[PDB]
Structures are given as structure tokens and as C-alpha cells.
Amino acid sequence: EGREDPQLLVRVRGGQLRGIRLKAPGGPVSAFLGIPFAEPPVGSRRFMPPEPKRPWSGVLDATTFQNVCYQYVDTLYPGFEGTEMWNPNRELSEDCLYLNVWTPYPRPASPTPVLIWIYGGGFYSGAASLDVYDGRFLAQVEGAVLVSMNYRVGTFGFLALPGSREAPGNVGLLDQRLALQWVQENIAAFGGDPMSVTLFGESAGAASVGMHILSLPSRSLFHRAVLQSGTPNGPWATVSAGEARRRATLLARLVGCNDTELIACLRTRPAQDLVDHEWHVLPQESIFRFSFVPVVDGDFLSDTPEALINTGDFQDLQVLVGVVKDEGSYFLVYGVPGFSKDNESLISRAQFLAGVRIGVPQASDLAAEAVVLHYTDWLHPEDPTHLRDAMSAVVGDHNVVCPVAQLAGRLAAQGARVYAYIFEHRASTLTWPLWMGVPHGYEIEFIFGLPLDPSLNYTTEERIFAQRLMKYWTNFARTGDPNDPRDSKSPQWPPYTTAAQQYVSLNLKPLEVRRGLRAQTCAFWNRFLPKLLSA
Amino acid sequence: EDPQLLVRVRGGQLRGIRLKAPGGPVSAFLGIPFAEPPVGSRRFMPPEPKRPWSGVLDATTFQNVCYQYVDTLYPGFEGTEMWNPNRELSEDCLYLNVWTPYPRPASPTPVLIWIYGGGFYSGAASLDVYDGRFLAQVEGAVLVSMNYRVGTFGFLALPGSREAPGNVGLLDQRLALQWVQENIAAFGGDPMSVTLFGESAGAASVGMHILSLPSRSLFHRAVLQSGTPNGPWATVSAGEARRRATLLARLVGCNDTELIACLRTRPAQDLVDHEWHVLPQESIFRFSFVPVVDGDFLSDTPEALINTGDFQDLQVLVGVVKDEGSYFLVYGVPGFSKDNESLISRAQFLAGVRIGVPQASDLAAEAVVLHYTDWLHPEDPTHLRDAMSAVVGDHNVVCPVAQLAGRLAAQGARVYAYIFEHRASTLTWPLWMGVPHGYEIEFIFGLPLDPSLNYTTEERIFAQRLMKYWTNFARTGDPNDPRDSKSPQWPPYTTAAQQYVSLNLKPLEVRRGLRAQTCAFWNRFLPKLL
Ligand SMILES: *[C@@H]1O[C@H](CO)[C@@H](O)[C@H](O)[C@H]1NC(C)=O
């Protein structure tokens, strides 16, 4: 070593890392970026569980983000900040199982609460390196240890021939889990308290957090959990073994291919080749069509999440959950005819019924009838502004809001401490049109503290809001309670209960309590609609 | 011999009585025969015109009430007795009543004809709440009301037979309307301006006259208060009527001809004894004998008929009251009584729904419960109680009334719609019933103007106001006072804007959408779910 900054050399079980002292608005942080936690899942290892990373010699350079797992790159709007902000920001490669650690500078003296981020991307995309997941502000301003991992997405992470040796399913979730294991063993080397790990994530990342709550080997690797705009239960986060087998077989044919032979063929296919076909598995017109998601394999998920959230014991569990004001708006522009980022997307009634078939592809004619009926404003059943907004609500309520409301309800009942929010602040910087409101995913930059970077052009009040939110999330990591134990001028955030159904609004104003999470409407999706899908 | 109380009608001479109304005298011709008594071989049969009479017939008193079940659920309770027959029961009952201003109108006066409700199993023109004296006096209206046959006597059909063709109670009504075309001028009435009005089954009857072509030439406007020809309760299929008829016959020990001949031989009270055993089906509206879709009087189900009809030259006033369903709960639904607050359990509510919507399959019941549950207070007994009322009101009245108002407007009528929200200070039902089925009639008819009745001074003004709405509609097709610039004007109900008004103590408020979402549930979804 000799001449290096002594505050930036740490040792983990695999060997020696050298980190980087990064600059944050109000001081420096330590970052150890691109630490490998698994043997690269390439060649013969494709589709297979991750193996722990064999120790290296010398000092690993952990100063830059690593490769991003092979994924489909969105090209709906070339040059558009609104979409590129989510696109990969490092080389694409199957060699991508690396995690990142942010800690205070100097790394803290007493052992600090850890926060682990699991990114979203509908299980087909995502990266711990994206700007909106920068751990530096949470590290610097809250003295938090923050960790985030890459996990395999799309076919590489989730294609399954359930029952087989070669492609058991859920390997993306298993990548995440091995990263949690890595945290237990090694986080202390950085001043992290492995007895205080809160998982947080958004969308498919939230669903991931939910599945760890639901999977036994993984329950011993964290204590608290945050699910933002996602759930393990619901229409898009899982597939039955049979369905997953159908899709895997189908994809195999598309690329030109006894389970051993099939997968052996698949494995001889170039990565890009699989990515080029992963969308053709469901011609089936469908927004939250994505073919490769966690399979209910009777192993990792011993049963469907709905079953498991109904009958598990969550007495020893604190969750924070919530949604943004406009969950579904975003999705409409990706294959509901009539919707665009470039006009005000006022649709016709005809375009609405047509969208309801696309948003709820698993719906009989009677079901679509029901949805349309429930979401039509009969005072103005022809008004395009309302219909546009209805279509958003439908997609939003079906995939996010009511799955979350269900999740909060069951959990609260089965003995958990649940806190619930609705995020209501549209970013002054947002580049999506006004009509989309506060779209899915646009709370992340606030929780991570991005508005504290003067150069990012957020308003002052947004900088105060960011800090407020960050306090909520870290307090929750620390105590299982978002409220401040000291400061009692600020309105309290009450637990969500079955009886009172209370949640709070997150916006530029002080906390306001509300009761019932889209109560009537979620009763429609969660209780009534299923029964209408008995033929 | 007051010559003002003396009239020559086509059948002969009549002598009325002079009646005392608060602000002056009214002429009155009670108990005028409009048909041959429908007795003996004439039971179940179409009414025939009454034969002429020698001398001066005494029309100074109310005639008999048509033979009907008498309510005994709450004996001696004012709430219930006021609906019960207030004269002798008899199958000889086809009489009508005319009220006119005294002295009798100097030029032809618009005529209002009342058709009482009672679910097609009860009711009388002679009840206190249909007293035509105030409308006659205060508004100078010629007001007519008739008895028509009810229950088995009026509605028992063996469709296609010559000897019990069905709908005779409606034909009774039609004949009274014919009688008015032919005789009302003699009272100062204008046969060129006949407005029908009725409540509940009287509303449905009014509606059936709208839908039946011979009736159409006998009136010019209509008011349907809290009832419709469409809906669950007002009509039956030819098939189902024949079933209920033969079942009633079998129940009293009885070929169409031979079956009816046998029924004809039975005392009236025998048929009424078994009237309520034709549908054991523990619903509320288990009344078995209602107008029948006969391909004759009703050329096709009302739904069909309102859907395809042409209502170009028609003005209609329709409305509901705030709490259509509360009244009925205490008759069938377990857990509901006039004597407590009827705060019910959830289980009670789900059982309540299978009763209030007896049509409902498991799923459709699920749907109703689902729709009406307040998922934020899903157990609160106050909500479940109020929900139950709502289920029953909406399904049988509010949504039918909306369905009709929409279709009439769409197909060219001119529609005015209200909701009645004022609870009579003198009501004797408990508070949890709100403003129940039937409790606007007393205001329309002008009862609070009679000081001996203890209605608040505000209520007396409110009644004057409603009497103006109704008679303005009668006079013009428009309820609005044409010497009232200052407004709140009452807007026509159009399918586009969907406006109605609140009838209560505060001045008119225009609201849009008569239970818009809930009635979409009843009218568009639930049908498909079956
Ligand atoms: C906006 O753009 C979409 C997508 O190309 C188009 O189909 C739609 O007609 C446009 N909306 C309107 C009506 O301006």
C-alpha cells in the first residue's frame, strides 16, 4: 500500500479492495464499487444458481461501477432523458454479479445500520449504477451504510424449466440473496451492523423485497423491509411453473432449440440473441407482459405469494410500503394506442375499452365490462380527459396500488407493523408531460437525496423534502419506525391497521393522514374481480 | 238544492256535497259509478260502461274500497293505518271522485287524475292523503281519482283466455280516463288538458298508460312519483301469470273456462287468504298479481317498449324520495323493525341482500354486497342498515326511475325530475327511515294547509310550492312558475346533462346525475351478470 489513502483500503472474505473517496454536497463519502460477490455466471453457468466468488489476490480496484447484466435497451424515445435515465450506464455483459458499498468518510466508529437497495426494471432490466440510485447522499447526510447489487434480469435471471437441474428458476432472486449473504459476512469490515439490515426497493425491486420476506432461507438475512410501488403478490411479479415452462420452451424454439438438450442449446446462443427474442414469447398484447419473472417453483417460493401472505406469521416484521399518485400513466405510452409522451393523450371511449383489454389481458369479456363500468364517470362517459385518466388508474390500480393495499392489509392482520404512504410530489425537473402526474418510479430520486446536488436544478423546497424523506427511510432502518423519537412538533405517522387503514401523504406540505387506500376500488380488484374469473 | 252541486253526466244527474277547505268552499262528487259492478260472472273480466240511471244519484260520499288484503303488521299504528282501507271492502268498487272549485270553474280547467299506489294489491281513492280538496280550492284544479281493481280481482290472468284476460285493473283505470274525456266538461274540466299523476303502483300504472296505445288518446301529460312500468316488481310474463293463477286456484280447491268458473264461485276473502302464498319465496315483493305482459294492453315488456317508443309530444315529471327503501325492510328483512334503530350485523346484511334482490344468483349477490359495502367501515351497523335500505330503494325505484327518465329523454319526451328530501314533522315511523316511500303525497295534495293537522308553518309553504309545481306542470308541461323571474329554474332532464332538483325546505337546488354510478351498476352490469 504505502502511499494510498488509508481510509480506502478494506478487506473482505474474498480479499483486498481499494475504494474511492467521492465528493458529496456537504462532505466526502467512501465508495467501494463493483465488488464481485459471485463467480461470473457465464458459459456453462448460464441459467444456473450463483456460486460464491472465489478469492482474488492483490488489491481489487473497487473505484468504478461494473458491467450491467445483459438486458434489453429501451429505444422508444432516443435522446429522451425520461427514458435514458433508466437505460444501462455501463457495458452490458453476463459477467455482472457485482455489488456496491457506500459508507461515511471516515468509515464510522460504532457499527452502523445498513440499507440494501434492489433496483426495479420489470425483471428484464436495471442496474445498481444508475444515477438515481447513488448512495452518496444517504451515506453522507444520514451516516448510513448503503449497499446495492446487480442481479440477473430477463432470460438470464429468470428463464426456468421448473424441476430441472440446469435451469431451476429464480436465479436472479438467488443472485440477490447471495449478495445479502455477502453483506452478513463482510459488511462489518466497513462499519456496518449486520444485525441491522433493512431491504428497500422499487417495483420489481419492491417485489423482490417482498419475496425475501416470503422465502425462508432469506428471512434470516435482514430485519426490516421497504416496498416502493411493488409487491410479490399481484398479476406481474410471478409465474406458475407450467406457464414458466411454456415460455422457456417457446423462447427456445424462437432461437432454434429432455430439458438438458434444450438448455444446452440455449447456452450456446449469444446473449444478444436471447434478448432479441425475449419479447416475442407473448405476442399477447399486454403492458406488464414480461415473460421471465420469478417462478412459483415450490422451492424459493413454496407457494404463490397470495397463498403465503394469507397464511404466514409476520409478527416479527416491520414494513414500510407505498405508491406514487400516478402509477399507471407511464405504462400507457408503451403500447396502449392513443397514448404518447408528445401530445396530451386525450383518448376516445373506444380507445378506452381497447386499452382495458390490453391492460387486463387475463380478462374475460364480462370482466372487461366490469372494469370499464367501474372506471366510467357516467356524468361524462365520453370525456377524453377523464378516459385518459381512467386508463391510467386502471393500469395503475391493477398492477401496483391494489396489490400494495392487499399486501398492507394481509400483513397488518398477520401481526406486522406496517407503515403506508402515497407519494404526491411531481419533480420540478421531470421531463415527462404534465398529464402523467407523478409517474411510477419518480420518488426514488427524492429518497436517495438527489435534490441535494446543487447542479441538478431542484428547487429549495425539494431539497428540504428530500431531507425529510431520507430521515423517514433511515429512521425506519434504525428503529422500525419512520417517526422521530425526539422531534414531536411534526405530525406522527401512524401504523396502517386493518381497523383504521391509515397512511400518509408525502408532498411539499407536512404529513397529512388519510384513511383507506383506494378502499372501494381495491375491494373491486382484490375481492370481486377474481370471482368474476371463474369462467 | 244548491245548483252548483248538481251535474248532468251522460248516465244522468248527480248531486255533490259542498266541502270546507281552509281558504274557502269546494264542490265534490264522491263515489260516481264509472262501470257496472265487476261482480259475480264479472269477476276477472274487463269493465263495462255503467248503465244510465233514473233520477238524481247521490254523490256526496265515498263509495266502497276494492277487495284487498288489509295490513296487520302494526295494528293501530298511524304509520300503517293511513294506508289501510277507510271504507267498506267490497268487489263492488268501480267509482271515481271529482273535486272542483266552488263556484264551479267559469272556463275549462286543466284536470289532474290521481291513480293510487299500493303495489297492485291494495289502495283506495278515498284515503286521507289523496284528498283533492286543497288542490281544487287553492289552485283551482279539477281533481279526479278512481278506484281500480287490485290483487287477484284486478290482476289475476290466464293469458289468452276469454274469461280472465289479465290487466283488468288497468282497464278499470282506462275506463275512468274514458269517463273523464266524456263527462268532465260538465264539471268545468278541460278534457283537452288531462294530466295523470300517481305514486308507486299508481306511478307504474301511469307509465303503463304511456306505453299502451288506446290510453294515449285520453291524457296529455304524466307524473310518475316513486314508481315505473320497467323494473323488478311492476310486471309479469304471460307464462308466469298463468302459473301463479293455476297455483292460486289449486290452493282453493279448483281447462281455462272450468278453472275460472270455479274461482268465480269463491268468496272474495278466500282468494285474499291465499294471495300471499303464491310466492312463498321470502322476498319482500312476493305480491303475485300485477299487470301482465300480454301482447295486448302491454304489446311487449315495458323495457322493450320504453326502449323503442316515440315520445315526441310528451311531457313527464318523474321523481323519487330520499329513502325509498327503508319502509320495506320492516316487512321481510330480518333485523329490521320500526320499534328499534335496526342497527344490523354484517351477516344480517348479506342475508338481507338475498331477500331484497331475490332475482340474484350467488355471484350477483356477491356483486351487490360488494358495491354497497363501505370498505372503510365494513362492519359499522349504521352503514349496513342504511346500505340495505339503499339496495332496496335503488333496485326497485331509483334506478328504474333513472332508466326511464333517460330513455324518455333519449327518445324525445320532455322530462323533469326531482328527488324529495323533506321528512314530514308529523311522521310516526322512526328516524332511521329518513323520508320513506309514500311521504311526499301528503305535501303534493296540500295537507299541511289544514291547520287542524299540526304541520309546521314552513311545511305549509313548502306544500303550496309543490302544489304549484304539479299544477304548473299540469297547465303547461312545465313545472316552473311563469310569473317567477327570480330563479333557480327547474331544468329538463336530458341524458346529456342529467339534471334534477331537490324538493325540500331550502329553495330548489339543481343537481346532476340521479345516482349515476349506482344505477349504472343496476341497469348495465347486473343484467349481464345473469
Ligand atoms: C397523440 O399521438 C398518438 C400516438 O402516435 C396518436 O395515435 C394520437 O392520435 C395522438 N393524440 C391526439 C388525438 O392528438
The protein residue whose alpha carbon is closest to atom 10 in ligand 1 is: A338
* Helix or strand holding residue B214 (H, E): helix B213-216
> Quick one: which atom of ligand 1 is closest to the CA of A345?
11
Give the whole-angstrom CA distance, residue B497 versus residue B120: 34
- From the CB of A501, is ligand 1 less than 6 Å away? no
Distance CA A277, CA A284 (A): 14
> A382 to chain B, minimum CA–CA distance in Å?
10
Residues A6 and A26: their CA atoms lie apart, in Å, by 21
Residue from A339, A343, A351 to probe ligand 1 pocket by mutation (most atoms less than 8 Å from CB):
A343
- Are the beta carbons of B402 and B81 closer than 8 angstroms? no
Sign of CA dihedral B306, B312, B315, B319: positive
Residues in B touching A501 (Cβ below 8 Å): 376
Phi/psi at B426 (5° precision): -85, 15
Using CA atoms, how far residue A321 sits from A160, A165, A327, A401, A517, in Å, is: 29, 36, 14, 11, 12
Kindly determine whether residue B525 and residue A373, on different chains, have CB atoms separated by under 8 Å: yes
Q: How far apart are the first and last CA of chain B?
A: 66
> How far apart are the C-alpha atoms of B522 and B484, rounded to whole Å?
38
CATH assignment at residue A327: 3.40.50.1820
Query: Is residue B389 flagged as an active site residue?
Result: no
* Residue whose C-alpha cell is 278466500: B270
Written as nine digits, the cell of A170 is 429464480
Query: Grid cell 293455476 — which residue?
Result: B246
Partner residue facing A378 (CB), from B373, B375, B516:
B516
Task: Give the number of the atom of ligand 1 that is nearest the alpha carbon of residue A343.
Answer: 1
Ligand 1 center–CA A349 separation, angstroms: 14
Nearest CA distance, A408 vs chain B (angstrom): 14
Under a CB-based contact definition with an 8 Å cutoff, are residues B344 and B252 in contact?
Answer: no
The alpha helices in A152-288, defined as continuous H runs, are 154-158, 171-186, 204-214, 216-219, 241-255, 259-268, 271-277
Catalytic positions of A are 203, 327, 440
Question: Hey, of B371, B375, B521, which one would you mutate to test binding to chain A, going by the most A CBs within 10 A of its CB?
Answer: B375
Distance (Å) from the C-alpha of residue B394 to the closest C-alpha of chain A?
A: 16
- Residue B388 Cα, gap to closest chain A Cα (Å): 17
Check CB contact under 8 Å for B375 and A515.
no
Structural domain total, chain A:
1
Q: Decide if B462 contacts B448 (C-beta within 8 A).
A: yes
Q: Which of A224, A191, A176 is nearest to A110 (CA)?
A: A191
For residues A139 and A106, the answer to whether their CB atoms sit within 8 Å is: no
Task: Please answer yes or no on whether B375 and A520 come within 8 Å at the CB atom.
Answer: yes
Look up the domain containing B458 and give its range.
Answer: 1-530
Kindly determine whether residue B525 and residue A379, on different chains, have CB atoms separated by under 8 Å.
no
CB B87 within 8 A of CB B63: yes
Centre of ligand 1 from the C-alpha of residue A345, in Å: 6
Number of CB atoms found within 10 A of residue B385's CB: 23
Q: What is the resolution of this structure in A?
A: 2.9
How remote is the CA of residue A338 from the centroid of ligand 1, in Å? 5
Alpha-carbon span A62 to A150, nearest angstrom:
15
DSSP letter at B325?
A: T
Q: Whose CA is nearest to atom 6 of ligand 1?
A: A338
* Alpha carbon distances (Å) from A424 to A86, A290, A296, A508, B503: 21, 28, 34, 8, 40
CB contact under 8 A, A501 and B528: no
Angle at A307 between CA A304 and CA A309, to 5 degrees: 105
Of A373, A523, A532, the CB nearest to B520: A373
C-alpha A211/C-alpha A214 separation (Å) is 5
